[PDB]
Design a protein around this nucleic acid. Structure first.
Lengths: 63, 79, 49
RNA sequence: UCUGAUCGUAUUGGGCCUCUAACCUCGGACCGUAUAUCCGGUUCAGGGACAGUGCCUGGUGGGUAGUUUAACUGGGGCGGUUGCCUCCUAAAAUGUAACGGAGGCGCCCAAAGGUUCCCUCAACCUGGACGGCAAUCAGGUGUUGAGUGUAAGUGCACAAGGGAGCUUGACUGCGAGACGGACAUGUCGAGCAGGGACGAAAGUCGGGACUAGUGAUCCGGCACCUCUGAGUGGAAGGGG
RNA sequence: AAAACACAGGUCCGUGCGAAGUCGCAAGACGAUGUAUACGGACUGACGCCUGCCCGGUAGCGAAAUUCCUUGUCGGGUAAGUUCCGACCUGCACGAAUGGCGUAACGACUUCUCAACUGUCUCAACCAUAGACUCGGCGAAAUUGCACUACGAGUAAAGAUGCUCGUUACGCGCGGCAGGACGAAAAGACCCCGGGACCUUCACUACAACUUGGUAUUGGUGC
RNA sequence: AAGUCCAAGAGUGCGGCAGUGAGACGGCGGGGGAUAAGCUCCGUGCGUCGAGAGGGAAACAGCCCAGAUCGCCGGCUAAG
RNA sequence: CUGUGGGUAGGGGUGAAAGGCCAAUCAAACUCCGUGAUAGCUGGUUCUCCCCGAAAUGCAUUUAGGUGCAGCGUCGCAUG
RNA sequence: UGGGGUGAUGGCGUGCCUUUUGAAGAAUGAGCCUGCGAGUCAGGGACAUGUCGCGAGGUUAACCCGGGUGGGGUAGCCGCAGCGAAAGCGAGUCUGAAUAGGGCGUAUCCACACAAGAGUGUGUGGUGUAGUGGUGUGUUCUGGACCCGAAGCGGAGUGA
RNA sequence: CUGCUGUGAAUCUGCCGGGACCACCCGGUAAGCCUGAAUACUUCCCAGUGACCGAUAGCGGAUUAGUACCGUGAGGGAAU
RNA sequence: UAUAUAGGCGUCUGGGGGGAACGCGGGGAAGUGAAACAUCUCAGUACCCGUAGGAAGAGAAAACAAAAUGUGAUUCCGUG
């Protein structure tokens, strides 16, 4: 039985060239009128997964 | 028969973050505060929420001007 | 309501560039105000949609 | 082919009334059949283009079924609470619990945002018809009192408080550096475009005195895009 | 085992007949070889009573049998008397124009008072039998971490044979008692938490049980 | 600045493979309670027990002394 | 009241109705199978020694006796 | 120096397990003995730790042949690159109307220059980067998944 | 691609598919069609094999074994 | 009745049933997981029904592909 990858984790996380798992940031989907553009710029782009969550996110991506 | 209390906001973890003599980088937050308990001194800016941050690299110093406590950055001699 | 999330769109580029609150009671008419259209690359008049 | 009525041939989908031929009748007779309240067939009688059972479709539906019906909690229930902000508890860094002590919330402001400039009374007297605990007011000092979008720490006659102009820092769109706080949250230097003020004078000032005024993801919209386009000369069918 | 169910009587509703209603997907069946004086369902539960100016008006009656009655007051019943029985009681009341009151008979129904009777008791004594007990034969059981398993006052998971300090106690039985071994028994039924089940419903969502369109199905004319 | 000097079995980062997320009492600073509880809830580079034997507290997890590598017909002491 | 022979079968039967009875079992009988149901809950989990050695906290949680992450235990890096 | 028992008497001495803050506990389990009774196996599964082969390569799956464990089998897989949502280059790329300003990548480490003290960059040269297949053990994935235990749910039947 | 219900296409200038459509096109010729061998499994029989069990194991069954026994029955089901 | 049919009668050839697995067609759960639960999962599984054959349909492309000198009757295996 092949280890199935977690669909949600695969859709929410990516690995860079060096293997860094990257993710997008929450609170940037709607309710944006009250959010200053500095906040949305902070929430923009991709950030490396926190070391605490890295183990479980790797588990979900690999199997 | 119950209590009307029980609410409280999160502690905002205010206060001095870099004390006197600490070498800081430009843009480093020196004081998280409500209002100007400390005022921006030399090479120190004041944030929108009253956060005092270093404008230039150097060592944190606390001074007094016109009876108001201020946070200054003293430039550190290059080695 | 009361203070709807109005959308300020430019007059020239006609791009819905900004979203901001406005008290409909104090300012019932469409909020015409000078803002920056990135498509136009300059400040242009924006008005409420 | 319009400014373009007007009538006529077939078709046409409904409604009233109809007769029969579908269909129906546990109404009769006969027959298969010697046995037969079955069944089927024939015929008559009656429904008789009337009603019906499939497919589709609304509605009612504890009749039946699968389920849900939170937690905290000085047991549980009852009551109360649940998120965010402020204070005290909190033991002078930070943080710190209780169904501990108090409150706020979750909005509001296009002029209460930006900039530039300027200010100036908290209470006694003389008084100031009316107008004393108050007027429009005038002086003095009260020395920084006093009061001041909404509770603590701040801001003062170095004004974050009070007035005025601009015409829209209502400073927005691209934002190294640093940082403070697990995600989330929060701070700003600074560089560029475009502007706003102040201009002589400098070149200076990134929503609100600051912390609450909010809700992840999913899924869907709506505008724009130099993206995609399930063979494509190509488009329609997803993304940013 | 009852005050509950049923019951005979009553009322309401449904059903015009392969009725309704039920068992079935259907056919079919029961209903019923019955036909509104009959069947089914619902609810009451013999039998008797329960209308006041107009039942043209305020409008459901104001009497009575109506006992929550705590009604106290008083008595009857006991020396002290519960159940209960009476008058006085209780005010817009209060609960029944049909659901409340009566009701002979009946009752292993609930409660009480009598007469009689008695070992129920004052208050126990004695007799017999079956056990128990003794002997012979056969011969289990639950339980069991152990063991040459005391008491006191303490201490300890806060109630000690096992620990402390003392007190007592020669070893082993037999017949008895049942205070403890938080004795045995049943992984507490109570309470809480998690799950389940079944039940209810104006919780959610479904499904079984009926109407609309056109299929089956469709001809003209009087229209 | 040094000190800890055959390092603390130190701190940090990254991968270990975890369990733990019921704590208890005692001392100090407090909340609730009646400034009761062997109460309850916090703080304490505070301790101990948990997970800790040994000695003293008569017995007596949490107090006091003291952290058991093993033996010994040895010695000195801790609290008592 | 009874004998004999029959009929009604499980979300069903039967019930003068007690959730009563339906093979000593009934708020949904029993047998087999799905099946080794599932259980954040109890219980059990078996040889040794050497080194190290916790936690009972924070945040979140249909969460509070569960769990995720962090804190705290266990080899190689850098560090002296 | 020795070498086994039996234990008057004295000192000390509160079963084992589980579960707990804490049990000798009057909390759980065990009457006793013997035997049995619980982290196992599958898979090119996933993540981490010695060996073959490289030299950028490792490997084969099905399958074919072999009387075996051997020989073939390149399909594919993983390395070989990245940035982007994609179109685009290449150690570059994406965001960017703005040779304006940043993230992710160009193993790593040396030296020499130019910019820098906002703490380090930009070039230039030099070493040339190490993944992969078996089997190593520990975790983990899907399976009952360390073992035991419900009440109950469903299907098909058996019972008056 | 396909079930049911309704409505319903000509003859190659047709029709269908390429995950709409002019079509640049390509592929193929359904419904009237029908029809082949070459891969799974083992009740049974034969010959074998085992870093399988060895009488509480291994099949429930080395022995009366689906027997005794239990149950009305389905069914459960040994010991030796 | 119209017989020009259903039925009746003779004869002949076949079917009934069983079988462990495998096949095809059809009906089709719930334990369970989603840490609740209804979508979903469990799972087209268990079970059931009808039917074979030694094996079981299609089948000789209304096929795929993508501008390629493309593959070319059908099924199973490995990859993808």
């Amino acid at each position: 039985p092949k280890a199935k990858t977690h669909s949600g984790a695969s859709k929410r996380f990516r690995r860079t060239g060096t293997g860094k798992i990257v993710r997008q940031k929450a609170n940037r989907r709607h309710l944006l009128e009250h959010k200053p553009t500095k906040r949305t710029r902070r929430l923009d782009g991709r950030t490396t997964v926190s070391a605490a969550d890295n183990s479980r996110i790797n588990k979900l991506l690999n199997g | 028969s119950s209590s009307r209390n029980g609410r409280d906001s999160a502690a905002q973890r205010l206060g001095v973050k870099r004390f006197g003599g600490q070498v800081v980088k430009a843009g480093e937050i020196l004081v998280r505060q409500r209002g100007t308990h400390f005022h921006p001194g030399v090479n120190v800016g004041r944030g929108g929420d009253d956060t005092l941050f270093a404008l230039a690299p150097g060592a944190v110093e606390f001074g007094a001007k016109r009876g108001r406590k201020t946070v200054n950055i003293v430039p550190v001699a290059r080695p | 309501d009361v203070r709807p999330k109005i959308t300020l769109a430019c007059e020239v580029c006609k791009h819905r560039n900004y979203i901001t609150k406005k008290n409909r009671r104090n300012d019932p008419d469409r909020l015409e105000i000078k803002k920056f259209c990135p498509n136009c690359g300059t400040h242009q008049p924006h008005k409420e949609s």
